């Protein structure tokens, strides 16, 4: 029952059978978001106007408005090396791979 | 300019209403600068709501 | 127990005591997001790589990975007319006010 | 080019495993074009997971 915060989430590609196409890396830290989004919202959550309004309304009457959710609001990329369709090795920067801040939306 | 997000990190991080009045004072210390920020009016109305919920005289 | 979808959420500024500073409008349709985010994810959800990976991991082992959440992924603005600090009437376009699509994040 | 999001809207919108094999065929009909899309490999591995969950011979 703690605030919306970032937590460890380890991603292992070998566990997902993606060893058949991913070269490197084989695992990375991705994190995940988890926590309560109740009124009021913290500065580091830096949410959307809609998020503010929905939170305030959920605080006023939880029966008529459900609370917002704890989700990633800033992400960073990682670069993966793989073999695509044409049997070509590709170094690609995949976006939105590492959660860097959580917030309420 | 506006600095209600500090009261959003001061009251939110801290049986009687000796603390809710402190939040009301934190918000009223900037009762002019934040005329426009949605979070300011939201916090004022939320303090009003919590004032008539736990019976604060 | 339905998919992550958009639902009606009516915002009435008079109910929030914001009648003391907002001129017009006095109410608008904002919508909200609600629904399950389980594997697989639909095309219209168009989610982030992290969202895909977290959903897949939650599907593999729900004990080690929690599911993603149903949140607004596209929003539209509305224009509000109000009186600010200096007793000046202002027509401002506030952003992220109307949910226009939901997704999993 | 890639079109796994239709199988993500066909199987996901539809006691036996006569339908999970249909999803496997939907994904294998494009077993080359989507070599790179995370959702393609995710759907393949998820079909593999659901294949060994409801006992499909």
Residue numbers in the entry:
A (entry chain A), C (entry chain A): 397 to 501
B (entry chain B), D (entry chain B): 47 to 60, 74 to 116
From the paper:
Repulsive guidance molecules (RGMs) are cell surface proteins that control processes ranging from brain development to iron metabolism. RGMs can bind to the cell guidance receptor Neogenin (NEO1) and act as coreceptors for the bone morphogenetic proteins (BMPs). Structural analysis of RGMs and their complexes with NEO1 and BMP2 revealed a common RGM architecture comprising an N-terminal domain (RGMND) essential for BMP binding and a C-terminal domain (RGMCD) sufficient for NEO1 binding. Here, we determined high-resolution structures of all three human RGMs in complex with the BMP ligand growth differentiation factor 5 (GDF5) and the ternary complex of GDF5 with RGM and NEO1.
We also determined the structures of the RGMAND–GDF5 and RGMCND–GDF5 complexes. Superposition of the three RGM–GDF5 complexes reveals common interactions between all three RGMs and GDF5. However, while the GDF5 structure in the three complexes is largely invariant, the relative orientation of the three RGMND helix bundles towards GDF5 differs. The RGM α3 helix, which is in the core of the RGM–GDF5 interface, undergoes a conformational change. The pivot point seems to be RGMB Leu103 (RGMA Leu97, RGMC Leu101). A relative rotation around this leucine permits the side-chain of the preceding arginine (Arg100 in RGMB) to be inserted between GDF5 fingers 1 and 2 in the RGMA– and RGMB–GDF5 complexes. GDF5 interacted similarly with RGMCND (Kd 3.9 μM) and weaker with RGMAND (Kd 16.7 μM). Our structures reveal specific regions on RGMND (RGMA Leu97, RGMC Leu101) that could be blocked to inhibit the BMP/GDF pathway but preserve NEO1 signaling.
